[PDB]
Every structure is written in structure tokens, then in C-alpha cells.
């Protein structure tokens, strides 16, 4: 099973080595992520020598390998169908490859979070936000992974979701590995990004649903490329999930001096960074728009 995945991963790698892609060495970097995924899968198999029995029963790991196989096939398939439009920056097939790369990066983060040192620890996973942890313990016990419907319904009982369309927006924000399951790890990331728990969904609504600045599934280089058109418009800014520091925010903005910087706010909630940054002239024009949301 794992042997079949490696051969698929191998092909994506050969596919992504094509010079016409001009792929930058910059996270998420598919040429690193697949070998590193392999290496971490090698590590887990090493820690389960003999007891492959136990590993094979593990629910999370089964979901993970299945998604890994699905994702690599989808990638191979995407190159097949896209042919030379893969090399055209700004093409849809190319954008799909970027987003896959991000999904691979999220998958590896999660696998490392659940198997640190290669040994399964999903059942003693320490959720960061105390209120979030209480919700997950009470609804799912020591479960590592739950189906989406299941997650949706439990969450809805504490934080009502307004509508089907909103539920689907929420699912695509939280489901980083795009596998219709929520992991305790995916859960931890979401509740870190959108804390405080007490107003979770309002927070996510204000920062992501109705915010023109928010950029789902965008990478560092995409933020850089996107803000270039606003290079003469200091104060133009957008923000997104950091890919290398999953659970923290990355705000990109155009400075008065013509630089494009990206920063990770610490020691203050994203709300406060945005309010302060508006107040001080750094974060004025979300995606270059003249009107900035009022987050007060």
C-alpha cells in the first residue's frame, strides 16, 4: 500500500522537475514535501516493526494513506489533462498545482503532529486553546479523526451555523487536507487561527467570510505576486494562513518605500493587528480596495 504511494509520489516528483514550470524553492515546495513525506512514512514504519498489526488498524493512518494516494493521483491526473497549460503562470491548471502543493504541506504537518517521532499520539494530542480542548473532549473523547457531518453537527450545537452555504465555507476553511474528515490537528489549527472560542464563528465570519483581505489557500509567492499590482498603493494588504507556521497568520502589505513585506502577528489577536495596522497606515486597502472593513 505504502509502496504504491511512493511510486505515485515518485512520478509527481519527476513531473514537477520539468524546467518549464520554473518552480521556485519556496514553501510549499513539492520537490521537498514528497521526499519528506516519504521520509516520515519511513520513520513511522520503522517504529512499528513487528507490530504492523497495530499500525494497520489505526483509523487516522488509514484515512491519511487513502488521501495521500488520492492526492498524488489527482496531481498526476492534473498534469495529464493540463499538458502545456501547466507551464502558463496564471492558468487554472497551474493554480490547481499550487493549491495541491499547499495541501501536501498541510498533510505532512498533520502527519507530524499526529505521529511525532513516528509513534501514534493522536489520542493524547494536546489542543492548544483550553476552551477548544473541552469541546473536542466532550464531543469526541480521544478520537483523532471524525467525519465532516459528524463534526458539523457537534459544532452546530455549540456555535450555530447559519446556513448550508456557510457550512460549506467553514468546511473548506477547516478541512486543510481536503479529505472530508476533520482531525484533532485540523481542529487545533482552526481554533488557534479563529480564537477566542467563545465567539469562534463570528470571528471566522468577520476575518474570512466577509473580509476582502483574506486569501484562502494562497502561498507566500502568490501573496507577493498578487500585491505587485498595488505596488504604487502603499497600505494595500492581504492575509492568509502561514504554511510553514500552521496556526499563525501571515499578513502581506505594500510599504510607502515600495517594498512588499509579510509579517506574522504575535502577542495580539489578528483583529488587533488589523485594527492597529489600519490605525497606523500599514493595513489600509484590503486586496487594494478603497474601503476597509470595520472590525471594531
Amino acid at each position: 500500500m505504502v509502496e504504491k504511494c511512493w511510486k505515485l509520489m515518485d512520478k509527481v516528483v519527476r513531473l514537477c522537475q520539468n524546467p518549464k514550470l520554473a518552480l521556485k524553492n519556496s514553501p510549499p515546495y513539492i520537490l521537498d514535501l514528497l521526499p519528506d513525506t516519504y521520509q516520515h512514512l519511513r520513520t513511522i514504519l520503522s517504529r512499528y516493526e513487528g507490530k504492523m498489526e497495530t499500525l494497520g488498524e489505526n483509523e487516522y493512518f488509514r484515512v491519511f494513506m487513502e488521501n495521500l494516494m488520492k492526492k498524488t493521483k489527482q496531481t498526476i491526473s492534473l498534469f495529464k489533462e493540463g499538458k502545456e497549460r501547466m507551464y502558463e503562470e496564471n492558468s487554472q491548471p497551474r493554480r490547481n498545482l499550487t493549491k495541491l502543493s499547499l495541501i501536501f504541506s498541510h498533510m505532512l504537518a498533520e502527519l507530524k503532529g499526529i505521529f511525532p517521532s513516528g509513534l501514534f499520539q493522536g489520542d493524547t494530542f494536546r489542543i492548544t486553546k483550553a476552551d477548544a480542548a473541552e469541546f473536542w473532549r466532550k464531543a469526541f473523547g480521544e478520537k483523532t479523526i471524525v467525519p465532516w457531518k459528524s463534526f458539523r453537527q457537534a459544532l452546530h450545537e455549540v456555535h450555530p451555523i447559519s446556513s448550508g452555504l456557510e457550512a460549506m465555507a467553514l468546511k473548506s476553511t477547516i478541512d486543510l487536507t481536503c479529505n472530508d474528515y476533520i482531525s484533532v490537528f485540523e481542529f487545533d489549527i482552526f481554533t488557534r487561527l479563529f480564537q477566542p472560542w467563545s465567539s469562534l464563528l463570528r470571528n471566522w465570519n468577520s476575518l474570512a467570510v466577509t473580509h476582502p483581505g483574506y486569501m484562502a489557500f494562497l502561498t507566500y509567492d502568490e501573496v507577493k505576486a498578487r500585491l505587485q499590482k498595488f505596488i504604487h498603493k502603499p497600505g494595500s494588504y492581504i492575509f492568509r494562513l502561514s504554511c510553514t507556521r500552521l496556526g499563525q497568520w501571515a499578513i502581506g502589505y505594500v510599504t510607502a518605500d515600495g517594498n512588499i513585506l509579510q509579517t506574522i502577528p504575535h502577542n495580539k489577536p489578528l483583529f488587533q493587528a488589523l485594527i492597529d495596522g489600519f490605525r497606523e497606515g500599514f493595513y489600509l486597502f484590503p486586496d487594494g480596495r478603497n474601503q476597509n472593513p470595520d472590525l471594531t
Partner: peptide, 11 residues
């Protein structure tokens, strides 16, 4: 090797 990435909070 070394390359521009994240920069300290301006706010």
C-alpha cells in the same frame, strides 16, 4: 539559502 521571508510586526 538565506532569502526574504517574514519580517517583524510593524504595528
Amino acid at each position: 539559502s538565506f532569502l526574504q521571508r517574514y519580517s517583524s510586526d510593524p504595528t
